[PDB]
Amino acid sequence: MKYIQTEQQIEVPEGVTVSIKSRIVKVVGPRGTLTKNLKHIDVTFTKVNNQLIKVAVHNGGRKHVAALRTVKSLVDNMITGVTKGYKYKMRYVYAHFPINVNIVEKDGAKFIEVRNFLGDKKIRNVPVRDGVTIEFSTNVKDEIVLSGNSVEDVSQNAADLQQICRVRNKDIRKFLDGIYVSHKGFIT
C-alpha cells in the first residue's frame, strides 16, 4: 500500500569491512573478499556507525518491500562467508553398485569424476566452480565435503552433483541411488 518507510539492520563484526557504492557491495574479512552487484532492487544504504549498516525502501509496494528483506539476507551471507565460511556434506547412497568418486584433472579444469552409478558404463563429470574446495572426509563412509566462502557457489556446486545422478526409466521410490546433501553448516 506504498508504505512510507521500511528499514532493515545489518551488523558487521570487528574484523569485517564493508564498502558499498552505487549498489556495489564488497565484503572483506579474515577468509577473503566477496563482491556482489545489486543494481536491480532500487534500495538505499546508509552507515550508522562502524558496526551497523541500514538499508531502506521509500514509498514501496508489497512486492518492492518483499525484496528489501532479501537484500539483508544476501549481504549477511557475504559477511558470515568471509568469517565462518560454509560447509556442505554429502553422502553416497547405493543398494548394489558401489559409487566411486574421485577428483580428476582435465586440461587444467579441476573436474570431479563419478563412476559406476547403477552399473553405468558412462563417465559422469561435474566441473568444480572457482573458490570451492572438495575434500573426502576420513572415518566416515562415503562422504564428500565442499567448502568455500560463497554460499551460492558451494550450494550450487553440490546441487550439480545431486542432479547428475538422477535415475531414469525406473521407480525412484525403489531405486534410491544417488548422492544427496546431508548437512549444511560452517567451516568454523
Partner RNA sequence: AGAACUGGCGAUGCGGGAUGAACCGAACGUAGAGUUAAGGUGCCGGAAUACACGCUCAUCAGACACCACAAAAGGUGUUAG
Partner RNA sequence: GCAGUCAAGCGUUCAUAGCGACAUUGCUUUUUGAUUCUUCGAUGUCGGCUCUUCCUAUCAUACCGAAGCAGAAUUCGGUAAGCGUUGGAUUGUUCACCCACUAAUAGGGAACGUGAGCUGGGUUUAGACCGUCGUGAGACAGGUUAGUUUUACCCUACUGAU
CA-to-CA distance for 110 and 49, rounded, in angstroms?
A: 43
Task: State which H helix or E strand residue 81 sits in.
Answer: helix 62-81
39 binds, among RNA, another protein, none (CB under 5 to 8 A by kind): none
Which residue, 43, 148, 34, 33, is CA-closest to 88? Answer: 148
Which residues, other chains included, contact 5 with Cβ-Cβ below 8 Å and sequence gap of 6+?
A: 56, 57, 58
Strand partners, 86: 148
Dihedral sign from CA coordinates of 13, 19, 24, 30: negative
Residue 107 sits in the site that holds another protein (CB under 8 A): no
Residue 170 sits in the site that holds RNA (CB under 7 A): yes
Residue closer to RNA, measured from CB, 30 or 61 = 61
For residue 16 the three cell numbers come to 569485517
Which residues, other chains included, contact 178 with Cβ-Cβ below 8 Å and sequence gap of 6+?
A: 93, 117, 162, 165, 166, 167
Residue with cell 506504498: 2
Residue numbers 143-182 binding another protein by CB under 8 A: 162, 171-174, 176-178, 180, 182
Residue 96 sits in the site that holds RNA (CB under 7 A): no
Residue closer to RNA, measured from CB, 1 or 4 = 1
Residue 114 sits in the site that holds another protein (CB under 8 A): no
- The binding track of 55-94 with respect to another protein, each residue x by CB under 8 A or -, is ------------------------------------x-x-
Residue closer to another protein, measured from CB, 57 or 99 = 99
5 binds, among another protein, RNA, none (CB under 5 to 8 A by kind): none
Q: Which residues bind another protein (CB under 8 A)?
A: 91, 93, 162, 171-174, 176-178, 180, 182
Q: Which residues bind RNA (CB under 7 A)?
A: 1-2, 61-63, 66, 166, 168-175
